[model samples]
Target: QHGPNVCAVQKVIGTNRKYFTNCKQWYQRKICGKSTVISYECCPGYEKVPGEKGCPAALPLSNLYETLGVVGSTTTQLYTDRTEKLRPEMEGPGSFTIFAPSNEAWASLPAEVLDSLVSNVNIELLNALRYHMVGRRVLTDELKHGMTLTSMYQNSNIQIHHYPNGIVTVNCARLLKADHHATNGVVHLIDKVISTITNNIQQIIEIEDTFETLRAAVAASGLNTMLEGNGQYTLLAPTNEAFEKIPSETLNRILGDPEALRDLLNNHILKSAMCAEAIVAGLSVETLEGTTLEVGCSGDMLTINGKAIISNKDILATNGVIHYIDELLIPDSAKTLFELAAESDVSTAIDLFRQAGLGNHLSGSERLTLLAPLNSVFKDGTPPIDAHTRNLLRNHIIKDQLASKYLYHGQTLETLGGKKLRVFVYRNSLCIENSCIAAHDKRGRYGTLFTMDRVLTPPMGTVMDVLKGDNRFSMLVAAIQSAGLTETLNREGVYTVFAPTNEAFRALPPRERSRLLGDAKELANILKYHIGDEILVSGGIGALVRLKSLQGDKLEVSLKNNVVSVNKEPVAEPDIMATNGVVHVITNVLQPPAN
Candidate 1:
């Protein structure tokens, strides 16, 4: 009877025997022994006053701040002053949900953070306070995990979570007490002071472990402060996983180069905050780095540059939105074509480009299409990388971007080295001049690169060099050497040779072939019959044209039935490019009409 059978109010009497059976509702209790009297207490936010049948008036009937003071929550004095100043809004109209942090929580903040915030020279304090306020009343029962609530701060939203263990949290800040109702709204006590001051577009990225590598790069590039500045920005932040995909040595090289790093970071930033919904397929958005980014949509996914997919979207910040991408969005920057070549199986091409000193042209703001030859093309090794070889490398670069699909049959492309290259389609394969495009669209910061099956030989070196490189011309090379015309052929004069191949030479009488080689003066005269002073590419030679041989005689050059002939000898292969001249392989050697 003194304990479970009696209420504290009824215990004042000697024995409340009748009160035990009548103890019904939580608020209905017996007053004394042998007598039953029921009393009721008001819920929170309501007050009991004289002559009032029930809790009739809202507590204090005053503003939100004063009501908190009456509630004995002196721990919220700092926030009380802040709420008083914010007036009309907090004290004003409809329902609201405020997560009020205790004085201990404010005092527990880092010294520098609290000091900077309270100094009140900036919006940091206001933003920090506003971050806790939800525009609508959210009772405890209405709370749910993963629910997003719009806050009083424009462009910012708060997330609510109810865990399985019965613990509730708002935006990762734990709630210690809840559902303290007031006339206008409800207030929940939180354990921490939330601040938007340090949560800008760049700050959020720096705080995440997934972006550690990107954070280091941003710090090294000195882009942290700039991104944290007032301007709204869209950040396509890459994860450590994406950064690790690149070879460490190559990544380190990029990070070490200041200009390259700048270009790379700039590529990921946009001038304004663009949410996921704002992006659509085929839309081109300009970047801070002065390049256009193409957006692509695959079902529900967002992709950058058609290659990088967005993993996390709509991470709200004070000044911007951050979207996490699985791959880095790199822009074409100061890296030269040579460096890109070195990244692939074109090391021999890189050496040739470097040795020829043409690598310098591949750098800077200019755009190009590099037809890079692979290691297989240089199986015999590069020709002595001299000025002429430099021209050969230059011929491989076109002035602008030409992706493989843009190439068409019969189209002529002008090269950087001042040569015209003809395009041909053979059995659906795209060929530029004599070299077929083996691979296409190896994208880089400044240009698109294509791999070629063969090295593009510029019209540079002497005809002797061209003939010497081909085993089919061995007989021709030996005949020229025996004729003692190597010195003349190696000179800088332009010449066109209608030379015969080994098979063609072996078709001659064995005695006649021996005589041509055994006699130097006669051999020189016979070789001169095949030479012309002017360089003539096969495509440029018309259907009919008379050729003047270096031996001072006219050779009939004709094109009939799509075949070219020199003095009735069918030119088996035409347009074999040479540095000093052109070589048209003939089936039979030309004999000068009795000089």
Candidate 2:
């Protein structure tokens, strides 16, 4: 008998006949019917990395789906949804081994078990997925019967059982089909959704108003088939009731019109799976319809249309993902950042760029890093862009391709216009230049997203225009002009100002309002408490940070989630960034405690 490789067996000394010959076939390749042993070597497009056997390939369809256990679902939305949410982890060069369960398996699970899994899939899936994956490429024959391999699922191992029926079982379920290969990985189909792991999509959808309609629409539109198709997609589904609210005939007419339906359908479908966290403002994604989709977020909700709110966000489907909206979104609603900003609420900020003599720069800008402020952040007294703060705000801006995610601690990226924004990490919080990204993990279109607690504007428009044009902001501008501080606001430099809100003026005791209006010096001092020479984003406000205002006196800026305080008054709202300065509205007119 021959050993696997050439080896001499000398035990046949007494038996001259050499009863059995070892390595007999080692000597012949042309010998027909002889025991043929073949060895596999590296092929093109593949390099054999040390400590691994077999060519590492791309992740197989079954492998990825199995790792997530979303096979056999009628929609690709599950897969699409998950892909976008996990993009931070999945979009990379790597290989893996996955054991996937079919949709039937997912359906067979108990209600409560299914509920819990879908609610926290992002937080809980890694450990369970690890159980089905081994550290290295393993061939089917290399697996010994009854062998166990530890999985990525924390402290878990999948038991391999080879039965006489020519079936291989992974864990308690049978691998109905095996050895599906890809450039990055391998897959085996199991019969059921793995029990140890949970699915979170279902629960996430239930609670969202926008998504509830979207969920129903998916069922109505027969979209599951397309989502589960081979191609990848990102869908912004309008809710079910959005159609209901319209005259039934109008919706039916639209749906009946193939061209209109096609346009509407195409409007929602993007070729890539993307999530809110990775979105950058000013970027547009081309959709399946050859159109583009815009992205942005505000307040507690994320939006697709300035008019439409995402009632339910980010739901994973089998092939693609779904983000539910409360309204039926039209093609125009998904305009690029520039287009959306051209709307009523954001137009004032856009005008600030033009009035500041930077309109040409903003429009022609290819790669820009705009620290756009929220429209609601400006109150009556603060101009959209003041002069001294305008240059200061411009100084803070450096034109470059500074995507939020690419920001690193201690690193600096030059802005597209000029200069550099130094990046830093404070207790895991990201700070750009001196501006702390007040809210982490925000949504935008062209690059990564973060928000501030005030509007950072430059001195672009006149104090008078800032008041008249901005309805909610007229009061702050009025106060600045009344105090004769309007001239100082039109300067050319970067400065931080914590502007008060309309409510702040309203909250002033009648006596104080009268006193400030009557006394220019006192009002000027009060305004000075807000204007800080240094560039202050919302993040600059700490427990003891003292800011010098336009009046040459100092005021304290303090921070909390959703609440900011300047001295004794609370800033009513945050996240207003202009080209030159940032504004946070106050609830009460701040009175520096009588010193």
Candidate 3:
């Protein structure tokens, strides 16, 4: 028998043999199932020679280039030249698998796209070829649906899918005829060319029809370069419809103002790549703008900061991923504590903050927390707007973004105005000093705002008088009265008194309490240990602060886990202001150091 095409001839030995001499390309076959043989003559590309046999050793099993050439593939010369230019060593490797697209596929592509691939030097062409080629031999049977094979190009991979109905696809290309074996590897003819020109985040935004407004904003803000840079960023992208939903005046103002525009765009971008599945409910991620954004998930839908819903998610790009949001994530431009107060409709609080000149502290880029008193608090006989009232307002403002959730049971926060605040939970509500936060977590760019039902009032009268009035301090008051320390506490000076509550003194062993109360000189020295010559606030102390007390000994003050303590005794409540000084209520009475 002959392979493909040949003329048959019977091979008979001795008497009746038709011996066709010099016929090298011949195959032996039994005629009529007998021992007599038959041979076939060569077809087109085959020939018979004297010394050779069996189709001339199969033409040495052509390499990939020659195999393509033999199959009349239009990609043969183009692939050959590219392999020679970019990967001359491709011919020298162990094995390679190529998905070659037909000439019709090239014709089907847009002229502009085709031009982009071939327009540049050999660089673009090489990248396109590398994406189609894998570094190892891969046969059709070896491929499984949903399998990703690494291509010759780094960071580029080809996804394979095979349907049960005998259909196979590589990325966006469909396989026409496959398993074309070459000497080094296998080749598959595909119906279309897979593009290697993947876009970056900036390019994706510009190319997407839904992001026209967002594209313009990014370009206007001069952030295109940054988005296009070599970074893995996660973008909460807003659609055109989202931008149209914004008030025209506000949108126009933002687009025109460079500073505002920069901040607004930055509010939507994160410095890392996060896909839809990575986002969890209440996940607070800081954005490129330095503010924070909370992610919310409901079933399959995702939202940002509880306001903007992610309508389309996980559009992957070379530099990042994009989650298309339905609403514009406009940053809070009004950042001052006074502005927060105004936004809350507490004009009285705003007036108070501005009048005290404390507005300047929050106006700039300071991260702060404002405990704004509601209008009702001011309406209930507003504290007289004097220096006393101004001091009270200053006491309400803390100088950092202390979200209510971050405040521990006994956290001490330093105020921007140099005052101090003690945070606690009372009856399931958050309180600072004596004021409860009626509405919590009003977030802004520069800080947080908490609305209060009552204004925080500083303690009135001297330190001795303050102790005299509080029911919890009666035992200490009596002890101070007996020791003749009341006059010294009542004296005009900025003293820091670490007062012990009645419970604390009551907690003392009966003998120790009596022993101290019975000896005036001994009790006075112990009382002096609790009094600091400097009016020190717990918030002002860093890791540790040493302050000289009236007893001529240093008080060891420290802050740990947001709680302030003096000589290892926790200050239960701090910054209780008085006419003579500031008072800190301690859970245990401080003992004098040993001589």
Candidate 4:
């Protein structure tokens, strides 16, 4: 027999011998058969070598550079520069795992990034390159989905994500191929650099494809440096889809304003890195913006201020941790009047408001009052594109918070567009111009939405221009022109004109009409009697309200059953807003009693 067969661990051996008795196959041996004996093996990673003896000493199976050349030639070139000096580190006896980036990975790096890695003078680059190497031969199958690999570079860890059917990622870089054993380690082929993250929250945020808007918002806010700083923090990042929820104009405005955007983003960051496990219901953390974010649960989901934080949570960054959220946490500073208006029920018409600038953003610099029109109020069930609803929308908004308590009857409210709107409250209901509130006095963080029953025809011009535009007021316009009151009435001033229709003049006796039109001085006095110095909306006259007209005579105004009356004459069309004043069309021209 062959004296004890010798073999290396890298080799598996079989021995042969003749047996005295043996089993046989039908077409082969029937009686005695030759039997194989002895089994042994030689290990991999080391090849056999002859000495002065029969057994051979094992050597390194292969060099990493040799194996890497096949799939990651570019990576070999990187280590090639220092190969002679660092051969032991690469081919040492200890098993190691190296994530060797593929040739294509170099193409993805930016100008300076690639420049630094390949630079001859970059002495510190060695450790970073070492970051791609793990201490053990970790096979792909041995990894857990959320497992982390400790790198050779200062014990820094590389994130591992094992996906079924989808490509697994290491450090947010896709794993092209893994478990390629080197001389003493495992090499993985990846497209993206096994780039070290010491990754700042901001840097991590930028790498996320879904966080583009948040990146932009941070860039716009100039807070990028803080996120990259040494201070640790936990960021609740809103996805791009979250930002799109805001009206575009509103978002544009919020980002454009440095102070406001800063305040907004600050609310999303906490002072310390908090993992998901630490953030359960009833936990409260302080935000950088000074707001306390109470961690609550939306059933099984975690939430910040009721805004649900989606999955892919607890992503570690060098400076902080990140958790993705579906909605932006609007601090009071980041909110706008438009967001509030956009958040209203679909029963109201918000299309026009959307056109107004999402950053068409109602001014967040001051409180806003939005008189949003209801959908049922739109004529023909569509927005007036030609010259109507858009203009009406612009006029309906005010840069002032007309709180529910302040929307008084017969009060005139000036809108942001410099146009006037008459507020008339009757029996506890409020009306702006001729439109009533369907669901009024809705409030939000930065604005108030008054859902109007109808769209208002924005006042076109001054009371003088108003009277001249309508043929029904021909007699009143003619009287103003005749009395030389056009210049005074057309100019800017808070004036409310009780305009009489031509029918009112026609209703008068022929002699009475002739006498009033003939004398300029007397006609002026009669017209002045119909004018009030104050701009009064019909809704403001909740009870009997007495006012002094321009003629220095008292005019008794009152609201009766939702109708407005001035000095015993009912307003035919009340709350007709004008640029400089209001024009309440009356059935009769008032006779200045007892001048």
Candidate 5:
């Protein structure tokens, strides 16, 4: 017979499962009378693509560009007109593997940039498209995770990656479909046009010695992660010599204070990429932190805001561009949160942020944002999507904790959205905020990225919100109100509550229950016995993990044989996390220890 639970593959249920990445895995199944066989079909939305029978054979065509015209229309047209002029060889062929982009990919470019490329072929346009094609044919399966393929473009190479969920990417663009063959080459359709730049903005900064001061400032403010992530932000990176021009004490203040440091950095960053030529052509731009910059150029000398001089400009990164300036750009304030102002215009950055949300589902922490939108988070919808709706949800899921190997109690983490929270790690399991490690991930393909960074949230619920919404905790809510503990639990603070259900309190003696409810002072003290000041995640409570309660008594918690208990009381429902902390519903009401 087949092994017990052989091919226990399909996981998650309801709407959550519909978008789950369904790949072909061997299932030893009993199909006939007694014989076991492997059988499979595409799961749900996957019917749009293919199944285990194997990838479709590459259909032969005239040439790479000609094949791309049919398989990758809009993107192909832009280049066909342009490349036919400057780089006509690509139109014919030379055993190329052209990673072509989709129509939406062409839409992603600026109107001027798109026009500049298609109208006439310049070194700017021809070399830009040159970055997407390689000299030899390479199948999607053949490319390694971190391998760089030399491109036809001079001074550029494409970095291709294989994600854990079986996605292949060329730079930040995911391969939408591949293996369409050409007589002289092959064409792989990618979702986005690969950026001309190879590495991220952060990589470029460290590669140059002059940006060391800017690098340290980014490290200090933790904006380095922002620059390193899937975000497309143009940083007015100040050089080391720029900081030297500022007073020593003032420099120390900006670098040391997180607020001052972030303001200074954000002020320098344009909300989105503005190429040097575009900025000089336009003559003005806005900072992400809420400020205006005016540019003046005279004989190639560019001054920003009439203050900072552009020593060098337009250093491109896949996520963004950089311009080296001679002075620090400081902002007036921290651009208070909840302002749906000009910042939302940077749809590219927001979409990248969401994709990073989706990225955590696959694996690898080294800039996981590109891997984000292939599955779950978007539900087969062409991504990336709506901001306000997805932002709060993604902020809870996309933790930058992927690269780290070590975890400890009460450790804090910074998610992609600039939100910070306490993270808890268990050996086979890991958690950030509310999302648990989704199943099939136990195999851990995307490195610890998926293992640690988890997914989804409770739709912005507080500890009290969860307690009040769950009907089983109704009695506990009433008692909490009578005891005046509503404000304590409702407000923001990391706390633990060994909550008792309505039936549990009902099981208590009628006289004692009435007496406890009537005596507010005694009720409050008894409630304190159930309350712990520290936040405790269920996974972290392995053996005898002891914690002190608000009542000044120690309570031992343990997860033994899948049964979670606190101070010998079985937790009927364990680990219900909310905005502030966690709640563990108990089978019995807690009593203060006798002194």
Candidate 6:
């Protein structure tokens, strides 16, 4: 009954089963049957490395995280927890190559996002984690330059692109370290996220969510062949919400009908795989959308229309590469942002912009100079805002027509909203009037979309908002509380404090913040240097002048050229005026020199 020397000890599956019928207590041993008998494979968590069937008994499978040296971290805990969750799909009779992202890679994510994943139990994150595991086990020697491996989830696969640079690229991740042998699987450390969502041309039809709609369109448009063909393409897939961003009647016509769907779907995809470096190579790449897309890369980021950010860089699949864009890439011909926001295709920030009645402002003019914030940027943080600060933040938007490339050093453009936006030029950063240009040089169509880490509120109530909120900024706010100034800032008074950026706090040597937090007097002086009394709006400042501060100390100011110089420091975020107060954003948290 068994093949060759293989002996079936006990039958694990069948009618009689292990526990037996309802009447039977436990007299369940069944001998080799006429039909197939079941034998035990290696236990869960433990895999046979090559020749071995069982793990080194002394080392438990539970030690996987310990073995990887990423214990205690949230990533490790999640991995350990998920190790049990994915067992059914991952282990049984399936061969998969897992390209797991290390804890370090996950650590760089924004804290709020990390927190969201913790509570939401994102299936996307699960699929992403599983995507690392491919359908078959493949070793380096077997990898071809352009080899593609299938994933267990989403029928997805990661393409194997061999660069002449010895190092190989897998999707957005690079092979930083490679080839660790395991009893059941192999491990390779990668640098970025690998999406395990479906990549198969046919099974893509089976996706039930919004993705399914795209697949249906792919088939209706006959673009399935082009997508499934040998051609290398960059598929910036838009979520269904992106499609809904179109007018309702139009969306109904597209999906409820058929012809409209094909053109809409065809408009989103690019014909080739332009990796991060390729798109940002300061050149234009052709898109399956029938339009020439100018690809630009600033560091690791890639921009298509200079508006939408392809958050997931290069997701290599057997067919080609797929970069998951947060916003649906609508051709220039699309009617409105309402179509985009109404679909809920992008981040929550976009939805809020629509809620705030800012959608028409975005869609009104073809070229929009927008300051898009990441979803987390809209959250309440430490030192919560008062009504005044909220009003100032709302005023940061300008209805001006300005292209980023045309922004010269020190040019001040008055926004349609009436406040003047200053342009600051640093070696590699661009600060657009008053706003810090927190995220500089993003890709766009006619104008550029500058990103800010925080929502730009007019300078009214930043500290109060933070105090009422809970975030890492809470610790900083607590220090302010300890200094007895929380009540002062939260009060209805005018104050222009040069606030420090989070990067500055992070830049502080961990040991120093730990020590400074312990010292009350030292922390107080550091706080004093940053707070200025006068409602010093940027337009009133000159190249160099001395102004009396609320702290009863005089400070120097300079607006030489386009740079706003404060004391010895060059102010980073300039001209953040408020009804009662003002705020000048500064990068690098300023610390008064030790007395």
Ranking by TM-score: 3, 1, 4, 5, 6, 2
Give lDDT tens digits, candidate 2, residues 169-238: 5644555445555344655556555534222333334455656654554445566456545543467776
Q: Tens digits of per-residue lDDT for model 3 on 3-37?
A: 44344544544333232323345444432122445
Q: Higher lDDT: candidate 3 or 5? A: 3
lDDT score at residue 214, model 5, on the 0-100 scale = 85
The clash count for each model shown is 4, 109, 1, 32, 5, 48
**Which stretches in model 5 have alpha-carbon errors above 4 Å?**
1-60, 85-93, 198-595
CA RMSD of all predictions? 22.0, 23.3, 19.7, 23.2, 19.9, 21.6
Q: For model 6, how does the per-residue alpha-carbon lDDT over 40-131 read when each residue is reduced to its tens digit? A: 33322233455544443333432223334322234633663664676444334434555666667687678876665555454645655666
Candidate 1 TM-score to native: 0.40
lDDT of 4 by residue, 1-595 (tens): 2112233111112321111111122121211112233333322222334443332554334666566764445654555456345455665577777777766666757888867756743364576667777777887676635467788877877877654323456665556555556667766676466656566788888898999889988987788889878865778898888889866876777788776688779988887655543332456678887767787554336667666656565677877678888877776546656555555562345666665443344545567777777665555766545555566667777767777567765577888777766665656556676666776466655677777765676667888778878899877887888888899888887777888998889889999987887888888899998888876776567688787888889788888986889888898888777877788899887897785
Candidate scoring better on lDDT of 1 and 2: 1
Better of 1 and 2 by TM-score: 1
Q: Highest TM-score: give the candidate number.
A: 3
Cα lDDT of all candidates, in order?
A: 0.68, 0.51, 0.70, 0.67, 0.61, 0.54
Error of 2 at 1 (Å): 66
**Which has the higher lDDT value, candidate number 1 or candidate number 4?**
1
Candidate 5, residues 204-277, lDDT tens digits: the string is 98899998888888877887777888865777888888889876765775576676677788888876655443
Candidate 1 at residue 265, lDDT?
Answer: 88
Candidate 2 off by > 4 Å: 1-468, 472-475, 501-503, 542-544
